[PDB]
Amino acid sequence: MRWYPWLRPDFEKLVASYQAGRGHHALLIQALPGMGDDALIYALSRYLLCQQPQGHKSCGHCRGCQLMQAGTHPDYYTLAPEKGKNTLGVDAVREVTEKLNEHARLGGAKVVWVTDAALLTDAAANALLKTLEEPPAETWFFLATREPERLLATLRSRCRLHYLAPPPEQYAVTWLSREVTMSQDALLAALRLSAGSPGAALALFQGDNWQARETLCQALAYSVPSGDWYSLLAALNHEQAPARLHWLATLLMDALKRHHGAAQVTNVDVPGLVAELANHLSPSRLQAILGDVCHIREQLMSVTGINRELLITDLLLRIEHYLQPGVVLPVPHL
Amino acid sequence: MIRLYPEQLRAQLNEGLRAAYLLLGNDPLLLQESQDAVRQVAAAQGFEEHHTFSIDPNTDWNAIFSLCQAMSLFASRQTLLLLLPENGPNAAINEQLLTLTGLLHDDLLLIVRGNKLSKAQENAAWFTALANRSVQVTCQTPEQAQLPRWVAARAKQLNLELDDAANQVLCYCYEGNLLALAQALERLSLLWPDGKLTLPRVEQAVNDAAHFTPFHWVDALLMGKSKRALHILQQLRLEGSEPVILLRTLQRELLLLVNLKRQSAHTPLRALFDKHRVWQNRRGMMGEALNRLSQTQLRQAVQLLTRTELTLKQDYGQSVWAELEGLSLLLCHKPLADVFIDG
Amino acid sequence: MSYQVLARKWRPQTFADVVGQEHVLTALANGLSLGRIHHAYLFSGTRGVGKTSIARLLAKGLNCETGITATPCGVCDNCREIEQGRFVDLIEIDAASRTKVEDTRDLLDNVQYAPARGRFKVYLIDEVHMLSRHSFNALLKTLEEPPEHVKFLLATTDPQKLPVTILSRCLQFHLKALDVEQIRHQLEHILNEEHIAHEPRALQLLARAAEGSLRDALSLTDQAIASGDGQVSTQAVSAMLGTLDDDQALSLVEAMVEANGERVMALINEAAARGIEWEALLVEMLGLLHRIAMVQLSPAALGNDMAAIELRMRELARTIPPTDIQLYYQTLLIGRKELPYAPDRRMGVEMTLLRALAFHPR
Amino acid sequence: MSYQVLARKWRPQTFADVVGQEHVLTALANGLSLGRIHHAYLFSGTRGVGKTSIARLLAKGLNCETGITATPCGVCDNCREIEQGRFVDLIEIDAASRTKVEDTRDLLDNVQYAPARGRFKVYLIDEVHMLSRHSFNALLKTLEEPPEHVKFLLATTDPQKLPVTILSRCLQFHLKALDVEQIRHQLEHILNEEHIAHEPRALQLLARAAEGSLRDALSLTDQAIASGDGQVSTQAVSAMLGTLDDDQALSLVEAMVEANGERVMALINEAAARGIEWEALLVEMLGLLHRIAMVQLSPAALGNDMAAIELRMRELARTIPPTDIQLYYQTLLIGRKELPYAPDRRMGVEMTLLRALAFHPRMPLPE
Amino acid sequence: SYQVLARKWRPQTFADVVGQEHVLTALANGLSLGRIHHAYLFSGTRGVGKTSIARLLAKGLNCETGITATPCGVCDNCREIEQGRFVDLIEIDAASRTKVEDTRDLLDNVQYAPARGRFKVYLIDEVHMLSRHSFNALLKTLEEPPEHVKFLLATTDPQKLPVTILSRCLQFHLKALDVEQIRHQLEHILNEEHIAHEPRALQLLARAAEGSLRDALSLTDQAIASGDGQVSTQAVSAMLGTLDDDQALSLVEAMVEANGERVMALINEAAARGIEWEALLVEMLGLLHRIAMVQLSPAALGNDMAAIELRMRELARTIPPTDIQLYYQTLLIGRKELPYAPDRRMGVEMTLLRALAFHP
DNA sequence: GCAGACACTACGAGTACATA
DNA sequence: TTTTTTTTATGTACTCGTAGTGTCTGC
Ligand SMILES: Nc1ncnc2c1ncn2[C@@H]1O[C@H](COP(=O)(O)OP(=O)(O)O)[C@@H](O)[C@H]1O
Ligand SMILES: Nc1ncnc2c1ncn2[C@@H]1O[C@H](COP(=O)(O)OP(=O)(O)O)[C@@H](O)[C@H]1O
Ligand SMILES: Nc1ncnc2c1ncn2[C@@H]1O[C@H](COP(=O)(O)OP(=O)(O)O)[C@@H](O)[C@H]1O
Ligand code: BEF
Ligand code: BEF
Ligand code: BEF
Ligand SMILES: [Mg+2]
Ligand SMILES: [Mg+2]
Ligand SMILES: [Mg+2]
Ligand SMILES: [Zn+2]
Ligand SMILES: [Zn+2]
Ligand SMILES: [Zn+2]
Ligand SMILES: [Zn+2]
């Protein structure tokens, strides 16, 4: 958690709406992961819950700010998946809803914030529906998603939406280079892979993701000219398998797009690699491999508890089958 | 401690009773027979207070009550029985049994019954405390190749003759289930006082009740025993085993097969088996499989298993069992499954 | 007047009145006539095949005044008394109702008391697969050192639900599901022992539809007599079964393979007269085609699950080339994929069957 | 006097007033006449075809004053409370509200006590497929050998949920869904008895709308009466159902197979003026295509409710190939798949019609 | 409820609801005559009004004047319903009381006489989330409830409902609201709230609501909170991500010509200007639809298609309808799969690559 | 008068199982 | 011999252990 400069306008606007008593109780943030998703929600919640003598800033002396910094306030509910789970169960939602009918202990307003509204199971969202539509007078909600459409349609209606604009790419590169010391092309590539959203591109360098990406690039450089797509299984099977699959998908998209001679490339840090991908693979084969990789990535994320070893191994075996001449490629279908 | 076999348990009890007996194993029949023998011999030698006391994590822990207190009525020696969990004791139970063995009357006999315990429970303080005086007897189900000798021995125990066809039929019908095997031998003894069991009698006096574990199915597929494989799958369907366990048990060996076939064209099998950490009993197994199935059948099997797993964990379908039968057909044997059972 | 149900009044009372299952009757007769009687018999079977009746007969035989014999006299006061519900030594425990250990203790403490009348206090615990874990522990403690004067008789439907330790101390008699011929023979005897006219074809249909259990056969016989105006005619039983048919799958796939459009239409109409989820019907039809394609590869594919429709299925496997089965499975799968978006589920499944029927013949 | 729901006012009160289900009524009446009374009945079948009503009628027949009579002799004292539902001995058990075994045990404890007034203490267990497994196992033995003065009537939608050991020891009566003609005739009787004017086409639409039930049909008729000014008129039924009668969609399919886009779009505009749901238009057209396929395969497949257009049906049955019918059906089915994702539902339907027109295998659009 | 729309603007009389002529007519005729029922089931998509019509029926049933079609207005046993100080009514959000125990508790408290009013009305909102055992529990009571209780059920969709529950209730299908009805209601609200509004921005809001009125109100509130506290065309256009230029047509032409570099540079520039991708795809489908419509008759040039007639005219002359249908199908599949993509931009890229490969 | 003695009712947990 | 073991979100029962309450008696 850290503050971002580009969050300052949105924050101000939204808080300016809240101070007048006109802001909607149910706010749905569209911020991309790594963007000012949690920082904005925390800032707004801290402003709302405690007193506001200083205006839109933080009055750290008041007991409300003290409880926020201690993280022990009773009227600041957080909906998060537990350590041992991934989705957000309906039991926590039901319990928080029952707790909401209780009047505020401190006599101030109430705030209920969900860490990520996409993680809700259908029952959880349905349970929230009634409280979102008709909440107690002291209550304000805050939702966080990457994709509003992935949410339940009825819940996506009751909650007023709000969008965070990704910063211009030059501004993003300027901000990233300040505290991250990498090459300009590598920095641009990391920014583009994260859909222009900082933090996530910063997260690629801060964590161990970048070394994994480089290992993946080396493995592709070894595999593509030989048609031996196996031995990629080691570079792909991981707790971040969707992210590395997305990296592979970006590489394939870059190859296919450069085949048409497009101006800009998603993967600029490794022009030789994408050039090799263009050389050794037919455009139809590249398109089929890209489609299959994206589909299996969606399979990995959607269904829960699926053994990834089997899925990535099957994907690689099917890719090796595709590279063989005289093989019918699949057709995208409804 | 003494590590012993069910055959020699009679001699071990005859020479002299030890402080405690740990009868362990996966089969019910041999465990029951050993426990009955121990109880009878203890009663012959002066043990009368017999207590059955399940250990399973629950609201049942007061065994200490029966050992700290001398018997007022008679100087009757006591016998305590413990039924270990399906996976063995945990850390809390480990220390609780360590406390239990911290104090034991010389006239108190301890009986513990459960499945095999790995090194994780073997090196626990409880077992190390028991390592001096207690005698542990292992009772394991004889393998499918070892069953006929055991059945012959049991027939000789009851003064019966079976020739060879009846022995094969009984081994097939009650494979991996010795309890039903002994009960059926007793039933055949009751049916014909002549004792000359033949096929035209054991054929209709037998059941199909069999027991299995996914390893048997995987090995049956590897050897290509089609009828045995389908029989195991049907028996597991009747038993109600979780399909996911079968899926994973096959997936491990199938990934190993895929990798070994991939590496076979460049490296000799002797080095590959050592590098891939393969058990010594399975080497030939793997060899046969590798020399039988090409990478095309392996890729088709992987596609089939992937479709099975995805339809299991996404569509919540019930077509899992028929699909695993299809995989059995497509694995070592006859690969057809043309799209029909190939996605 | 009071016409007792055929399921009750025709319960056997001697071992000679028990159909088939000789592998258990002979064993029990040899055990009783000789001295070898185990301390606890556990009876197993499938859905009304003769477990409780044989257990009651065994309890009758154990306590007969003439002595422990294979054949009870049926005349002494004990035979008459156990014949009816009332008797002291034989304790009939509905284990499925008194599952709690609190109720089980009140009846397993009676073992310490002497039998009032007969040699053995016999506990007939019916539906034993329902007891609670603690009750099972209590019953195991009783069975570990049972008194010489008490014999336990346990009857159940699913033996494997029992814990292994209790099963290890019981001699288990597994009762075979009755064959079609034995069913038909016993049904003919039952009908002839009473005043019910019949036609042999009707009894053949009853036996085949009884799924190898005498209770099912007798229930269907009473239903047929009721709807048959006091006479069991072939047409009455056939029409009733048509009202009761559930295997629309195999018949419909037979018609679809043979390409009888009118038969497919009639069978769809019949399956619409009965409330049937079309998705379930289609998916299990896919399963039947899957099993057919498997049997194409190896005769051992058809396990013991589908023994009631083995012959037909085997025929359908033998007479049809595998390629047609693969094509039928493909078209049925794609029809089921688009099924929920059709006009109606009935409507969509109808046209899916039409698509599958237009190929190969016609 | 007063206005109570048809679904509860017109519940059958005798075996004469139960429409259809000839086999179950015949078997029950015949068995009661012969005196052969089984001690466990299980009425299966789809929703709203009379299993609860038939069971209550069986209770009437069993507990009637004059004796065990197949036909309940009108209204006697022991039948008045059955009609009012306050009977001393007919124990209605909402099994879904008593699924726990600790309630079936209480049910079984008092089973032996003699009936207060009736000949039998008929236990009517509504929704028997909802009892917990323990309660099932509890009632096994009491079903096997019940006391001579108790009977069990079990009614459920799907018997498959019940353990087979319960299906064994009880009679299984299966109530087939009623035919369209049965529903239409019963509805004509009901609307005549209510002194309400009605239109034959309206009642045919009511019969077709309900899937072989009756209480669903009665509910939809009551909703029609609400939508109309106390009258069931064809326009009111068309509005409430959202259907296209049998003419407009036929005009659509006739124009589409004629490859005349102008009339297709003109009727699309008219249907928009009719204020009708677009997916309803698509589903009606798909149903018409399927009916064409059915009549092409089976020569005699049209019911009476389509007779008004039957002739035109046969025209398409003699003019268009089966392959073209399949092509149109699959094209419009993908159109249905894609419609919720088009920019506008009207726009999507226009695109689906134009797609069926462009891939017309006989008169495709010029390139 | 300070200034949140669609909460302080809940309808309070039958004359105030928007559209729903059939449902309102049926309910009014039932109330006016004796034709009352014990299970009404209002089903329809989001924000068409299920709960509101339910509450209006409840107010009409329990009014001091008696069974009245139009609710009175000023009275105690109607203002209490409006404020939630109700005792004859029971609102249960079934999505929270899914447990069968709570449903059995409800059925246990169904015999008790109401404290006030003639009917104890149980409003079960979000019916389809009840667990199956709860549904079976409610089944018998719905079949034949006591004369003094009436059930009202509202669900987003009836598919999840067990078919028996459908066969128990009177089904009222709330049709989605057309563009004109939504626009009229929003203009009426803004006029009654004295908020500056512009007809074009109002049309964009009505178009983006997708036939659900609560969405229209929420979008109006988002516009009000944005901009300068007033509804203006520029602010609404900016926030909705709508495109009002010929970028869509240029992209269609480039994709038809398969000009890869140009057709990708167009998407790159669109991302630079930040055009929302779902709207861009929707307009692409609209333009292809106009192509297909013109191929039947040039009068199906959408009005005068702004001022770019020629282009589409030219396009309508150069591409066979088969390729147009192929492009439309590919674009629609891409729109369906667009949410299930790592990010919308690259999903639109996938859709464009799929569309370009048909020898364009 | 008073624990105290049951006597009973409720609740948690361990466990089984259903559905999707 | 040998060690080897899996999806989950949610809901529904059943059974035992143990606390909290009532009352009722011979204390
Ligand atoms: N072997 C048999 N001989 C005669 N009748 C039988 C036999 N088995 C079952 N039945 C019939 O089925 C009815 C119920 O039998 P029962 O023995 O209770 O079956 P279960 O094994 O399921 O308890 C009996 O009344 C009898 O009519
Ligand atoms: N066979 C039938 N004959 C006449 N009315 C019927 C019939 N089946 C259903 N109904 C109508 O439906 C109403 C309720 O029927 P019911 O018997 O409860 O169906 P269910 O089988 O679903 O419980 C009855 O009041 C009656 O009007
Ligand atoms: N027909 C309508 N007339 C007026 N406002 C409506 C209408 N439908 C929905 N709304 C608005 O939507 C808000 C929620 O309506 P509601 O009736 O709860 O929809 P639902 O059917 O989805 O529960 C209401 O507060 C009202 O502002
Ligand atoms: F009485 Be049996 F076990 F069906
Ligand atoms: F009992 Be029915 F399903 F209305
Ligand atoms: F939001 Be509504 F109840 F569908
Ligand atoms: Mg029985
Ligand atoms: Mg009913
Ligand atoms: Mg609602
Ligand atoms: Zn503060
Ligand atoms: Zn006798
Ligand atoms: Zn009468
Ligand atoms: Zn009022």
Side-chain angles (χ1 to χ4, degrees), chain E residues 122-190:
Chain E
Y122 286 62
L123 180 47
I124 312 170
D125 207 0
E126 290 307 321
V127 191
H128 62 292
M129 312 301 318
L130 289 164
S131 60
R132 189 169 57 89
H133 289 66
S134 167
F135 269 123
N136 282 272
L138 289 177
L139 197 44
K140 196 273 212 183
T141 286
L142 270 184
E143 155 68 351
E144 50 180 7
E147 67 286 9
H148 74 83
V149 63
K150 290 184 193 300
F151 286 73
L152 306 183
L153 300 163
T155 178
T156 307
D157 47 350
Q159 290 96 310
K160 326 289 182 294
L161 289 177
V163 71
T164 56
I165 291 295
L166 277 77
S167 65
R168 297 300 212 287
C169 303
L170 297 182
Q171 307 194 42
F172 290 125
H173 271 77
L174 304 190
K175 289 194 219 64
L177 277 301
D178 292 331
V179 181
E180 281 309 313
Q181 300 160 305
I182 298 175
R183 185 209 56 74
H184 183 73
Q185 168 74 355
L186 269 64
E187 193 164 3
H188 200 76
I189 298 301
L190 288 182

Side-chain angles (χ1 to χ4, degrees), chain A:
Chain A
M1 199 171 144
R2 59 178 289 165
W3 188 259
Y4 312 126
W6 64 86
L7 209 72
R8 291 281 288 180
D10 262 7
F11 179 29
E12 281 303 318
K13 196 173 186 181
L14 274 299
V15 71
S17 172
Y18 266 95
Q19 57 87 24
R22 203 181 283 265
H24 207 272
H25 61 266
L27 184 72
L28 189 153
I29 307 295
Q30 209 170 348
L32 298 173
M35 189 72 109
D37 188 324
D38 290 3
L40 190 150
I41 297 300
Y42 186 102
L44 275 296
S45 191
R46 194 222 40 75
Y47 161 80
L48 263 67
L49 168 52
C50 69
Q51 302 300 313
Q52 41 196 53
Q54 282 294 317
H56 303 288
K57 292 277 180 306
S58 177
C59 49
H61 56 88
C62 82
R63 81 153 301 151
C65 289
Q66 308 163 352
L67 290 177
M68 304 328 269
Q69 294 134 25
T72 43
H73 203 286
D75 284 326
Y76 168 74
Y77 305 102
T78 305
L79 266 295
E82 292 83 2
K83 194 203 181 273
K85 303 177 170 339
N86 203 336
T87 65
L88 166 65
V90 69
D91 289 329
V93 163
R94 201 197 318 282
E95 157 68 347
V96 164
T97 296
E98 302 294 353
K99 196 152 307 300
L100 261 186
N101 277 14
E102 309 175 359
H103 280 288
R105 281 75 178 272
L106 276 78
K110 282 176 275 187
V111 62
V112 175
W113 157 47
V114 304
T115 58
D116 184 323
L119 310 176
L120 270 75
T121 74
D122 49 26
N126 288 280
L128 286 175
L129 293 184
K130 183 41 160 41
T131 307
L132 272 295
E133 164 204 8
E134 293 276 30
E138 299 166 353
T139 61
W140 322 82
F141 281 74
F142 287 112
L143 303 178
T145 58
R146 192 179 73 67
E147 209 77 40
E149 268 71 2
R150 294 185 92 174
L151 302 178
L152 213 52
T154 179
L155 191 143
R156 199 269 311 291
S157 80
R158 290 176 177 79
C159 185
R160 164 202 157 186
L161 277 80
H162 167 51
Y163 182 76
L164 271 69
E169 288 200 350
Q170 292 303 319
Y171 187 97
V173 168
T174 294
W175 185 93
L176 266 68
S177 68
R178 171 191 295 177
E179 63 272 34
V180 178
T181 315
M182 320 297 317
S183 175
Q184 65 278 32
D185 59 356
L187 187 63
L188 274 157
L191 176 70
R192 273 165 188 152
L193 305 185
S194 292
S197 45
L202 188 153
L204 283 198
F205 298 116
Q206 195 177 358
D208 202 2
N209 299 284
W210 187 259
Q211 295 86 330
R213 189 184 174 280
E214 157 67 354
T215 311
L216 187 57
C217 303
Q218 290 175 36
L220 269 67
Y222 172 84
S223 164
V224 184
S226 76
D228 178 20
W229 271 88
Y230 210 89
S231 81
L232 268 294
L233 177 59
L236 270 73
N237 64 335
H238 190 262
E239 50 276 32
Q240 301 160 342
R244 306 181 191 204
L245 269 195
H246 167 60
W247 299 345
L248 172 63
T250 57
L251 272 295
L252 295 174
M253 192 88 55
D254 207 324
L256 196 49
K257 204 185 295 180
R258 191 187 178 279
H259 185 276
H260 296 91
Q264 212 181 96
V265 296
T266 313
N267 295 114
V268 72
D269 46 15
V270 295
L273 183 63
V274 56
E276 206 87 4
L277 276 296
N279 290 122
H280 299 63
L281 303 186
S282 75
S284 298
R285 283 196 284 178
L286 277 157
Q287 160 72 20
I289 300 301
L290 177 60
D292 191 359
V293 162
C294 182
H295 183 246
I296 210 64
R297 173 181 178 278
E298 190 273 331
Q299 295 297 322
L300 284 168
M301 270 176 287
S302 176
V303 307
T304 176
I306 192 152
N307 184 320
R308 42 190 189 68
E309 273 310 330
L310 183 46
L311 289 174
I312 293 91
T313 306
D314 182 71
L315 169 69
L316 271 298
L317 295 204
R318 271 193 269 127
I319 293 186
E320 276 201 349
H321 186 52
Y322 283 152
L323 265 74
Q324 298 324 296
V327 170
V328 171
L329 303 183
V331 174
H333 275 296
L334 177 49

